[PDB]
Swiss-Prot record, chains A, B:
NCBIfam families in the cross-refs: anthran_nbaC, PRK13264.1
Description of activity control: Inhibited by 4-chloro-3-hydroxyanthranilate. Mechanism of inactivation involves the oxidation of the catalytic active site Fe(2+) to the catalytically inactive Fe(3+) oxidation state, superoxide production, and formation of two disulfide bonds between Cys-125 and Cys-128, and Cys-162 and Cys-165. Enzyme can be reactivated under reducing conditions.
Iron found in the keyword field: yes
Binding site for Fe cation 1: H51, E57, H95
Cofactor note: Binds 2 Fe(2+) ions per subunit.
UniProt cross-references to InterPro entries, sorted A to Z: 3hydroanth_dOase, RmlC-like_jellyroll, RmlC_Cupin_sf
Family: Belongs to the 3-HAO family.
Pathway terms, separated by semicolons: Cofactor biosynthesis; NAD(+) biosynthesis; quinolinate from L-kynurenine: step 3/3
Gene Ontology BP term (one): L-tryptophan catabolic process
Native source species: Cupriavidus metallidurans (strain ATCC 43123 / DSM 2839 / NBRC 102507 / CH34) (Ralstonia metallidurans)
Keywords: Dioxygenase, Iron, Metal-binding, Oxidoreductase, Plasmid, Pyridine nucleotide biosynthesis
Protein name: 3-hydroxyanthranilate 3,4-dioxygenase
Annotated residues for binding of O2: R47
SUPFAM superfamilies in the record: RmlC-like cupins
C-alpha cells in the first residue's frame, strides 16, 4: 500500500502550513512513522544549542535565507543556506541552525535513529569555546522530546556554567 | 570536516548538468560516498523494469512531469509526479519510473543499502500480469551495476519468457 499517501504539490503544502512555519511551532514534519524524517522549517528562529546527529542531514533552502553555525576542524564556522541552496551534512558535525527570516522555508531530510544510536545536544561557552553541557537523547519524537531538554538547560545555572572559565551561558538567547 | 562540501545553488547545478539529464545518461548523483544517495533524474526515458527497493525513496519533481507505474494491492496503478509534487515511497512497493519530458528534473533521495540487504529488479508479463523474471543485486554502484543486469534481460528470450502463459516479454521497450 501507499502507506504515506499519494504525491502532492509541495509549494501549496508549504503555503497551507505557513501558520505553523513561524513561532512558536517553527517546523512541521511532512509524513509520520516513516524512516525518512521529512521536515519543513520556517522562521524566524535563533537558537544556541548545537545538534550532534549520528546520521546525515540533507538541506534544501526553498524560500528565504538561513545559516548553520558549525564546529568544523575545531573552529567556529558558518555555512550559509541561501535561497536555492542544497547541502549534505556529514554525521556528527555540530550544527546550530539560525533562521532569521519570516516566510522562509527549508526542506530538511534525516533518518530515524535506531534504538541505541543517540543524538547529542550541546552548548558551548561564548568566552572560551569550551563545551558547557551535553545531553544525549534517543530521539523518537523531537516535537515533544526536545522542548523539555532545552528548557532544563535554560533553567539551570549549573548546567549553563562553563567548567573551564566559569562563565554562565546566557541560556535561551545568545 | 564538511566531507560533502559547502552548500550550493541547486537550480544552477541542474542547469549545468542538463547535458547529463537526458539520454543516454539520464541521471546524475549529487554527492559521492554518502549514506543519503541524492540523484537528479532527467528525461526522456521509459523503462519496463520494476524496482523493489528494501528502503524508502523520496521524490520531488522539480521540473516537468513524470509518473511511476506501481503494483499496489496486487493491481497495476499509476502515481503521477506532476511538477511540484513530492512523494514518499514505502519499502518494497514495486515501481517503474516513466519520464516522458525532456528538460524534466526530479530529485530522488534514497539510502545506501547495507551489505546483505538486496535490491530487486523485476519484469511482469503484459498478457497475464505474472512475474517473468527477478534479479536481486547488492546495489553499490547503480550507474555501472544496473546496465549489464538490464542488458542481460533484454538479450535472453529465456529470461523474458513468462512462466505462466508463455508470452515473451518485449524486453527494452513496452
Ligand atoms: N535541521 C532541522 C531544523 C533546522 O534546520 O532548523 C529544524 C527542525 C528539524 Cl526536525 C531539523 O532536522
Ligand atoms: N528513482 C530513481 C530514478 C527514477 O525515478 O527514474 C532514476 C535514478 C535513480 Cl538512482 C532513482 O533512484
Ligand atoms: Fe540537525
Ligand atoms: Fe568558558
Ligand atoms: Fe527506485
Ligand atoms: Fe504471462
Amino acid at each position: 500500500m501507499l502507506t504515506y499517501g499519494a504525491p502532492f504539490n509541495f509549494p501549496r503544502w508549504i503555503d497551507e502550513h505557513a501558520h505553523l512555519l513561524k513561532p512558536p511551532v517553527g517546523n512541521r514534519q511532512v509524513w509520520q512513522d516513516s524512516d525518512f524524517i521529512v521536515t519543513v522549517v520556517g522562521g524566524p528562529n535563533h537558537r544556541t544549542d548545537y545538534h550532534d546527529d549520528p546520521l546525515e542531514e540533507f538541506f534544501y533552502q526553498l524560500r528565504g535565507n538561513a545559516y548553520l553555525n558549525l564546529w568544523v576542524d575545531g573552529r567556529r564556522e558558518r555555512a550559509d543556506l541561501k535561497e536555492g541552496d542544497i547541502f549534505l551534512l556529514p554525521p556528527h558535525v555540530r550544527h546550530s541552525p539560525q533562521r532569521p527570516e519570516a516566510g522562509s522555508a527549508c526542506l530538511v531530510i534525516e533518518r530515524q535513529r535506531p534504538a541505541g544510536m543517540l543524538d547529542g545536544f550541546e552548548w558551548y561557552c561564548d568566552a572560551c569555546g569550551h563545551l558547557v553541557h551535553r545531553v544525549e537523547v534517543q530521539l523518537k519524537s523531537p516535537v515533544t522530546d526536545l522542548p523539555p531538554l532545552f528548557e532544563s538547560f535554560y533553567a539551570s545555572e549549573d548546567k549553563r556554567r562553563c567548567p573551564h572559565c566559569g562563565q554562565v551561558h546566557p541560556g535561551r538567547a545568545a
